Design an enzyme around this catalytic site. Sequence first.
Site, PDB file in Angstrom:
ATOM      1  N   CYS A 180       0.798  -1.220   0.000  1.00  0.00           N
ATOM      2  CA  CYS A 180       0.000   0.000   0.000  1.00  0.00           C
ATOM      3  C   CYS A 180       0.836   1.278   0.000  1.00  0.00           C
ATOM      4  N   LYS A 218       3.116   1.830  -2.925  1.00  0.00           N
ATOM      5  CA  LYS A 218       2.288   1.766  -4.135  1.00  0.00           C
ATOM      6  C   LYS A 218       1.553   3.107  -4.253  1.00  0.00           C
ATOM      7  N   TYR A 250      -4.954  -6.422  -9.334  1.00  0.00           N
ATOM      8  CA  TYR A 250      -4.962  -5.097  -8.750  1.00  0.00           C
ATOM      9  C   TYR A 250      -3.502  -4.603  -8.842  1.00  0.00           C
ATOM     10  N   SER A 269      -6.291 -13.912 -19.213  1.00  0.00           N
ATOM     11  CA  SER A 269      -7.697 -13.911 -19.639  1.00  0.00           C
ATOM     12  C   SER A 269      -8.345 -12.523 -19.491  1.00  0.00           C
ATOM     13  N   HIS A 323     -22.392  20.118  -3.050  1.00  0.00           N
ATOM     14  CA  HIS A 323     -22.034  20.701  -4.329  1.00  0.00           C
ATOM     15  C   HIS A 323     -20.916  21.696  -4.167  1.00  0.00           C
ATOM     16  N   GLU A 360     -21.428  13.604  -5.009  1.00  0.00           N
ATOM     17  CA  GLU A 360     -22.871  13.828  -5.008  1.00  0.00           C
ATOM     18  C   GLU A 360     -23.634  13.057  -6.105  1.00  0.00           C
TER      19      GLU A 360
HETATM   20  C1  LIG Z   1     -19.595  32.846  -3.236  1.00  0.00           C
HETATM   21  C2  LIG Z   1     -20.641  31.762  -2.959  1.00  0.00           C
HETATM   22  C3  LIG Z   1     -20.227  30.441  -2.887  1.00  0.00           C
HETATM   23  C4  LIG Z   1     -21.167  29.419  -2.648  1.00  0.00           C
HETATM   24  N1  LIG Z   1     -20.758  28.130  -2.598  1.00  0.00           N
HETATM   25  C5  LIG Z   1     -21.611  27.143  -2.397  1.00  0.00           C
HETATM   26  C6  LIG Z   1     -21.206  25.734  -2.355  1.00  0.00           C
HETATM   27  O1  LIG Z   1     -20.053  25.428  -2.492  1.00  0.00           O
HETATM   28  N2  LIG Z   1     -22.210  24.800  -2.160  1.00  0.00           N
HETATM   29  C7  LIG Z   1     -23.521  25.172  -2.007  1.00  0.00           C
HETATM   30  O2  LIG Z   1     -24.382  24.338  -1.845  1.00  0.00           O
HETATM   31  N3  LIG Z   1     -23.917  26.413  -2.024  1.00  0.00           N
HETATM   32  C8  LIG Z   1     -23.072  27.424  -2.208  1.00  0.00           C
HETATM   33  N4  LIG Z   1     -23.518  28.723  -2.236  1.00  0.00           N
HETATM   34  C9  LIG Z   1     -24.984  28.993  -2.033  1.00  0.00           C
HETATM   35  C10 LIG Z   1     -25.794  28.658  -3.304  1.00  0.00           C
HETATM   36  O3  LIG Z   1     -25.226  29.370  -4.448  1.00  0.00           O
HETATM   37  C11 LIG Z   1     -27.280  29.027  -3.037  1.00  0.00           C
HETATM   38  O4  LIG Z   1     -27.755  28.294  -1.898  1.00  0.00           O
HETATM   39  C12 LIG Z   1     -28.149  28.697  -4.225  1.00  0.00           C
HETATM   40  O5  LIG Z   1     -27.658  29.322  -5.388  1.00  0.00           O
HETATM   41  C13 LIG Z   1     -29.591  29.165  -4.036  1.00  0.00           C
HETATM   42  O6  LIG Z   1     -30.314  28.823  -5.260  1.00  0.00           O
HETATM   43  P1  LIG Z   1     -31.602  29.733  -5.363  1.00  0.00           P
HETATM   44  O7  LIG Z   1     -32.369  29.340  -6.616  1.00  0.00           O
HETATM   45  O8  LIG Z   1     -32.490  29.517  -4.010  1.00  0.00           O
HETATM   46  O9  LIG Z   1     -31.137  31.294  -5.466  1.00  0.00           O
HETATM   47  P2  LIG Z   1     -30.300  31.578  -6.819  1.00  0.00           P
HETATM   48  O10 LIG Z   1     -29.562  30.374  -7.226  1.00  0.00           O
HETATM   49  O11 LIG Z   1     -29.232  32.757  -6.554  1.00  0.00           O
HETATM   50  O12 LIG Z   1     -31.273  31.943  -8.014  1.00  0.00           O
HETATM   51  C14 LIG Z   1     -31.653  33.297  -7.948  1.00  0.00           C
HETATM   52  C15 LIG Z   1     -31.825  33.853  -9.369  1.00  0.00           C
HETATM   53  O13 LIG Z   1     -33.004  34.628  -9.349  1.00  0.00           O
HETATM   54  C16 LIG Z   1     -32.738  35.831 -10.156  1.00  0.00           C
HETATM   55  N5  LIG Z   1     -33.779  36.791  -9.765  1.00  0.00           N
HETATM   56  C17 LIG Z   1     -33.925  37.414  -8.528  1.00  0.00           C
HETATM   57  N6  LIG Z   1     -34.967  38.159  -8.516  1.00  0.00           N
HETATM   58  C18 LIG Z   1     -35.573  38.078  -9.724  1.00  0.00           C
HETATM   59  C19 LIG Z   1     -36.743  38.644 -10.288  1.00  0.00           C
HETATM   60  N7  LIG Z   1     -37.551  39.496  -9.522  1.00  0.00           N
HETATM   61  N8  LIG Z   1     -37.044  38.316 -11.588  1.00  0.00           N
HETATM   62  C20 LIG Z   1     -36.263  37.478 -12.337  1.00  0.00           C
HETATM   63  N9  LIG Z   1     -35.161  36.922 -11.842  1.00  0.00           N
HETATM   64  C21 LIG Z   1     -34.789  37.193 -10.558  1.00  0.00           C
HETATM   65  C22 LIG Z   1     -31.312  36.180  -9.705  1.00  0.00           C
HETATM   66  O14 LIG Z   1     -30.601  37.064 -10.554  1.00  0.00           O
HETATM   67  C23 LIG Z   1     -30.675  34.790  -9.681  1.00  0.00           C
HETATM   68  O15 LIG Z   1     -30.176  34.415 -10.987  1.00  0.00           O
HETATM   69  C24 LIG Z   1     -22.566  29.762  -2.470  1.00  0.00           C
HETATM   70  C25 LIG Z   1     -22.959  31.117  -2.542  1.00  0.00           C
HETATM   71  C26 LIG Z   1     -22.026  32.093  -2.787  1.00  0.00           C
HETATM   72  C27 LIG Z   1     -22.511  33.504  -2.874  1.00  0.00           C
HETATM   73  C1  LIG Z   2       1.798  -4.299  -4.208  1.00  0.00           C
HETATM   74  C2  LIG Z   2       0.720  -4.450  -3.145  1.00  0.00           C
HETATM   75  C3  LIG Z   2      -0.182  -3.408  -2.946  1.00  0.00           C
HETATM   76  C4  LIG Z   2      -1.196  -3.504  -1.922  1.00  0.00           C
HETATM   77  N1  LIG Z   2      -2.036  -2.471  -1.707  1.00  0.00           N
HETATM   78  C5  LIG Z   2      -2.944  -2.504  -0.743  1.00  0.00           C
HETATM   79  C6  LIG Z   2      -3.866  -1.340  -0.442  1.00  0.00           C
HETATM   80  O1  LIG Z   2      -3.795  -0.294  -1.122  1.00  0.00           O
HETATM   81  N2  LIG Z   2      -4.777  -1.496   0.629  1.00  0.00           N
HETATM   82  C7  LIG Z   2      -4.813  -2.652   1.351  1.00  0.00           C
HETATM   83  O2  LIG Z   2      -5.611  -2.758   2.291  1.00  0.00           O
HETATM   84  N3  LIG Z   2      -4.010  -3.705   1.098  1.00  0.00           N
HETATM   85  C8  LIG Z   2      -3.090  -3.719   0.123  1.00  0.00           C
HETATM   86  N4  LIG Z   2      -2.267  -4.801  -0.095  1.00  0.00           N
HETATM   87  C9  LIG Z   2      -2.412  -6.006   0.731  1.00  0.00           C
HETATM   88  C10 LIG Z   2      -1.849  -5.840   2.114  1.00  0.00           C
HETATM   89  O3  LIG Z   2      -0.460  -5.540   1.990  1.00  0.00           O
HETATM   90  C11 LIG Z   2      -2.086  -7.155   2.896  1.00  0.00           C
HETATM   91  O4  LIG Z   2      -3.493  -7.450   2.907  1.00  0.00           O
HETATM   92  C12 LIG Z   2      -1.574  -7.028   4.329  1.00  0.00           C
HETATM   93  O5  LIG Z   2      -0.224  -6.632   4.279  1.00  0.00           O
HETATM   94  C13 LIG Z   2      -1.618  -8.358   5.068  1.00  0.00           C
HETATM   95  O6  LIG Z   2      -1.107  -8.100   6.386  1.00  0.00           O
HETATM   96  P1  LIG Z   2      -0.503  -9.412   6.964  1.00  0.00           P
HETATM   97  O7  LIG Z   2       0.122  -9.169   8.318  1.00  0.00           O
HETATM   98  O8  LIG Z   2      -1.680 -10.463   7.154  1.00  0.00           O
HETATM   99  O9  LIG Z   2       0.581  -9.984   5.902  1.00  0.00           O
HETATM  100  P2  LIG Z   2       1.957  -9.151   5.957  1.00  0.00           P
HETATM  101  O10 LIG Z   2       1.665  -7.694   6.053  1.00  0.00           O
HETATM  102  O11 LIG Z   2       2.790  -9.408   4.621  1.00  0.00           O
HETATM  103  O12 LIG Z   2       2.875  -9.480   7.271  1.00  0.00           O
HETATM  104  C14 LIG Z   2       3.740 -10.589   7.004  1.00  0.00           C
HETATM  105  C15 LIG Z   2       5.151 -10.457   7.669  1.00  0.00           C
HETATM  106  O13 LIG Z   2       5.476 -11.740   8.175  1.00  0.00           O
HETATM  107  C16 LIG Z   2       6.877 -12.002   7.862  1.00  0.00           C
HETATM  108  N5  LIG Z   2       7.053 -13.460   7.975  1.00  0.00           N
HETATM  109  C17 LIG Z   2       6.572 -14.468   7.122  1.00  0.00           C
HETATM  110  N6  LIG Z   2       6.885 -15.651   7.573  1.00  0.00           N
HETATM  111  C18 LIG Z   2       7.578 -15.508   8.726  1.00  0.00           C
HETATM  112  C19 LIG Z   2       8.153 -16.414   9.672  1.00  0.00           C
HETATM  113  N7  LIG Z   2       8.038 -17.786   9.501  1.00  0.00           N
HETATM  114  N8  LIG Z   2       8.795 -15.904  10.738  1.00  0.00           N
HETATM  115  C20 LIG Z   2       8.909 -14.551  10.941  1.00  0.00           C
HETATM  116  N9  LIG Z   2       8.375 -13.643  10.096  1.00  0.00           N
HETATM  117  C21 LIG Z   2       7.708 -14.082   8.987  1.00  0.00           C
HETATM  118  C22 LIG Z   2       6.968 -11.476   6.477  1.00  0.00           C
HETATM  119  O14 LIG Z   2       8.265 -11.259   6.008  1.00  0.00           O
HETATM  120  C23 LIG Z   2       6.153 -10.170   6.587  1.00  0.00           C
HETATM  121  O15 LIG Z   2       6.958  -9.017   6.943  1.00  0.00           O
HETATM  122  C24 LIG Z   2      -1.280  -4.701  -1.114  1.00  0.00           C
HETATM  123  C25 LIG Z   2      -0.347  -5.746  -1.361  1.00  0.00           C
HETATM  124  C26 LIG Z   2       0.630  -5.620  -2.347  1.00  0.00           C
HETATM  125  C27 LIG Z   2       1.583  -6.755  -2.530  1.00  0.00           C
END
Ligand SMILES: Cc1cc2nc3c(=O)[nH]c(=O)nc-3n(C[C@H](O)[C@H](O)[C@H](O)COP(=O)(O)OP(=O)(O)OC[C@H]3O[C@@H](n4cnc5c(N)ncnc54)[C@H](O)[C@@H]3O)c2cc1C
Ligand SMILES: Cc1cc2nc3c(=O)[nH]c(=O)nc-3n(C[C@H](O)[C@H](O)[C@H](O)COP(=O)(O)OP(=O)(O)OC[C@H]3O[C@@H](n4cnc5c(N)ncnc54)[C@H](O)[C@@H]3O)c2cc1C
Lengths: 487, 491
Positions: A58, A61, A194, A216, A466, A471
């Site tokens: 892991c 990798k 994998y 395969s 969002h 989402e």
């Molecule tokens: C900088 C910023 C970042 C944000 N980031 C996030 C975020 O990451 N995630 C998130 O969920 N929310 C975010 N929000 C909040 C999100 O944008 C609002 O919750 C969402 O847009 C509300 O949708 P709405 O339709 O209720 O109002 P609006 O989406 O603003 O729709 C209002 C529209 O009605 C028009 N309108 C108004 N009055 C009239 C009218 N009398 N006649 C015709 N048209 C009119 C306006 O011009 C506007 O286009 C963010 C807000 C801001 C300001």
């Molecule tokens: C390339 C690769 C990528 C992987 N990526 C992921 C990942 O992203 N996420 C994930 O969850 N898993 C991953 N795995 C699997 C994960 O490494 C194993 O599931 C996990 O290490 C098993 O833990 P373990 O203790 O049961 O075996 P091990 O972790 O291998 O522990 C075994 C240890 O026992 C020692 N040993 C063996 N025999 C003896 C003995 N007789 N006396 C003393 N010591 C001994 C060995 O040398 C070794 O150090 C990956 C494996 C590989 C090979």
Amino acid sequence: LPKSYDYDLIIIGGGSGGLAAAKEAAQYGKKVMVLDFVTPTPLGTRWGLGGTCVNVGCIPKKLMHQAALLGQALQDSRNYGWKVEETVKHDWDRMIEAVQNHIGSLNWGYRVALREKKVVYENAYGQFIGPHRIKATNNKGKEKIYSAERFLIATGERPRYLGIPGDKEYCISSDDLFSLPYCPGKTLVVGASYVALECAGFLAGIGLDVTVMVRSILLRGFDQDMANKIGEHMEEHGIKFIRQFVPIKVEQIEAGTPGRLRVVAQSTNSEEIIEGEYNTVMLAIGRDACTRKIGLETVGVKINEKTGKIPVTDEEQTNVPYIYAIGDILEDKVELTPVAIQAGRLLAQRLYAGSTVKCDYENVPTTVFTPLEYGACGLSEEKAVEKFGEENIEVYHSYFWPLEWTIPSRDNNKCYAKIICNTKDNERVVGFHVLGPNAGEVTQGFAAALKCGLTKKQLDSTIGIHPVCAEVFTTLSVTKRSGASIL
Amino acid sequence: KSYDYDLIIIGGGSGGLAAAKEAAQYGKKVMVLDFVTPTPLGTRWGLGGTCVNVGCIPKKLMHQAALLGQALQDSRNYGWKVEETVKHDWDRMIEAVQNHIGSLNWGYRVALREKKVVYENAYGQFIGPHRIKATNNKGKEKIYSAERFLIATGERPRYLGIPGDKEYCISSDDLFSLPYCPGKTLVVGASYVALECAGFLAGIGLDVTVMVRSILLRGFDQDMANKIGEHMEEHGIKFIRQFVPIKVEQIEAGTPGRLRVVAQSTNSEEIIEGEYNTVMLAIGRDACTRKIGLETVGVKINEKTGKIPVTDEEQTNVPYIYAIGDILEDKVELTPVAIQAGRLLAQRLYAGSTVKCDYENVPTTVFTPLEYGACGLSEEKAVEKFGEENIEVYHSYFWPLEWTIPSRDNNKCYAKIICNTKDNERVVGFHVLGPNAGEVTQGFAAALKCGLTKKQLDSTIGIHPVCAEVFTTLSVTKRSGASILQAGCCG
Ligand SMILES: Cc1cc2nc3c(=O)[nH]c(=O)nc-3n(C[C@H](O)[C@H](O)[C@H](O)COP(=O)(O)OP(=O)(O)OC[C@H]3O[C@@H](n4cnc5c(N)ncnc54)[C@H](O)[C@@H]3O)c2cc1C
Ligand SMILES: Cc1cc2nc3c(=O)[nH]c(=O)nc-3n(C[C@H](O)[C@H](O)[C@H](O)COP(=O)(O)OP(=O)(O)OC[C@H]3O[C@@H](n4cnc5c(N)ncnc54)[C@H](O)[C@@H]3O)c2cc1C
């Protein structure tokens, strides 16, 4: 007479599950010992305490995956106004060094965690020799024998090879790649696990010529619709594929750092045989349980001699009562670090603290870190149909396009989302699949939702956030049955 | 009963366009009036609403430009050969952001044409029962009748009643299209908009300052708020606390010019003054409910706040008139919520649905430099509602694997869930400060809709290696006393 064994618990294997159980156990005041030893790779690569995940899994990798994502981040930044060149060069060496340096920091940490928790750590190979007794062989050969009231087998697995000419001698595997001392150059990864795809993925992401030879299908076991999409994405973004071919021999046209090898492969349904030249050849075809050479026979532990996995109870107990096992080595469980850790932790609690909570291996979430991440939890679409019947399964899906990708103007409609529902069960969400950025982060929470019995109705009543990828799941309205396009 | 339309929607924004489309789908004759009254400086924009033109969309996109700058620095240690300092081009950025907005504007128009919805780019005002006047851009008016009305008018950036603001100051409405780099900027207020913009502008390379009246992010969890504060301060953004500006004056017009802000302490007779290139006002927003002739038809609104009280079905005091969106009183001022309401409302009317919009535990994400996602009760609000003794708080720090190689920001990310011990430790509040917090929060929200329990949480397995996993293993409570410094060298 009354427990005078050397330790209350001995843990073979200092990896994910091993160290977890070790720490949890120590916390309740038990005398615990952890044996961990790392048997070199055919090329002689070895590493510290930690397990597969820390040194060869892991951790490294993911980090290289990140190096690849950052290259993409350098290109994406141009349109957002950052003045960067069109082509930025990457340094393999600089990267590995950084990755290995982090790893080192983890090795040492685990060592210190152990000392601090008063757990004995012997860097030696273990093997049972008779009831409640094990032999530990250190690196020089010196051996010692220990007794213990219970044992935990957490030994993990290792990269499997092909029984073919030139592999152990010229080929590398997951174990070697993360510490390679030279840029791998034209690479050929063999297999479609994998691991196979993840590595082919980051290797391509950092600029190398990569090819993937598949026997395969891709990702057997995972949802095939999703897998195929991962394939398609990889193919559309560099990575080349050779489908339905297994190699039969590898020969060194010339040693070097890297050298030049020639791989000869044969069709899996034609008598056709091909050959190509590559700088490196990674074998990522599967892994083998380390359950064979630890003298389980001397103590009576029954293992599936076919697969290598150790059958075990729902409490992680083997046939032999005082011996337990967790981790990859288990039979029919989940081969993932968090699972290993959960089992280790809970087991120790069940023994030394009266806990009665069993590890739950159902709907364990997972993420495949391919260039386009894929996260998942629950049944695949195939396995869902099979289990409840085609007629009782509704599939809601939708494409989606990450806001962040619009300015760079790329990859519209590649990301994909789908949930699988059980019509017979108030449309329970039995499968969650997402192909897209930060897939792991997206999936984690929906997993806790499946553990709660998430219903399509309840999902529909959740408001999305969002603007964020996740989402798309709150408003799925098109079913696959319906026939409507989502493109 | 012979009206011109089955439904007229004032406001073509988030909730507006959502209800429009949903209603049209059941074959009703629908009309949408959307007009954009310029900003004191004269900025205007297309169809879409606040979110599309001057909200979420452009806000996140710039947040992204700031993240990519950081990505450029992070890439060096992972081996990418990039310079130590890369320069940013304000103009190129905005052009790109405005180009996407444009395509969105056009999109929405086409979506209305395609669904056979009439769109009038005109300002609306009720003139008498079931009748409204629509005044276009040139002045030409027309009157329409309809069996029902939907007020989805939204709000606008509120100003300070002080010398020099409407004349020299910009707001959320102007910033996203600014024709010149704002240079040394001063953001006034501490709303999520305030911090988010201070954040990306700083991330883009500008000298940024934030003047605050009292507390940061009033309404949100204060422990979390403080943490964001602290993160921003530690990463560039300067703060002037407890000060409201009293006058702004132009020391020299330009693109940008030079202004001088004079501010007064909020508890001392102290007064200060500083010079800045731009001064953004982000103190709050005002409901567009006052100038639409609501009296001519009987619509009762809270004359104090401006918000329209409404039923659980989004109905006003006047039966054939409904309202959704920011305008509502005691709801949730978020695009997805407007959209949910609009959609559901139309189903209730034109399709026999009996599904009401659920405003409880609506998730949210403040896109500051270090995102903050959340759902349910804050810690404060939880204690009050269930009692200090019945609330357990599990918390932990965490360090993104992605940040280790670049070796930065250890123990800044933070996670915390609030549980009700009287209710099987139900998870009543979810808070996370870290990367991709929206992506991390979305799913846990669906979990709270399911009655997620700490027990059930603990039984879920984490995904490794991913930030979100920190929630699967919370073992340290705040009551206990244990320290939570998670990640030095290991575990
Ligand atoms: C900088 C910023 C970042 C944000 N980031 C996030 C975020 O990451 N995630 C998130 O969920 N929310 C975010 N929000 C909040 C999100 O944008 C609002 O919750 C969402 O847009 C509300 O949708 P709405 O339709 O209720 O109002 P609006 O989406 O603003 O729709 C209002 C529209 O009605 C028009 N309108 C108004 N009055 C009239 C009218 N009398 N006649 C015709 N048209 C009119 C306006 O011009 C506007 O286009 C963010 C807000 C801001 C300001
Ligand atoms: C390339 C690769 C990528 C992987 N990526 C992921 C990942 O992203 N996420 C994930 O969850 N898993 C991953 N795995 C699997 C994960 O490494 C194993 O599931 C996990 O290490 C098993 O833990 P373990 O203790 O049961 O075996 P091990 O972790 O291998 O522990 C075994 C240890 O026992 C020692 N040993 C063996 N025999 C003896 C003995 N007789 N006396 C003393 N010591 C001994 C060995 O040398 C070794 O150090 C990956 C494996 C590989 C090979």
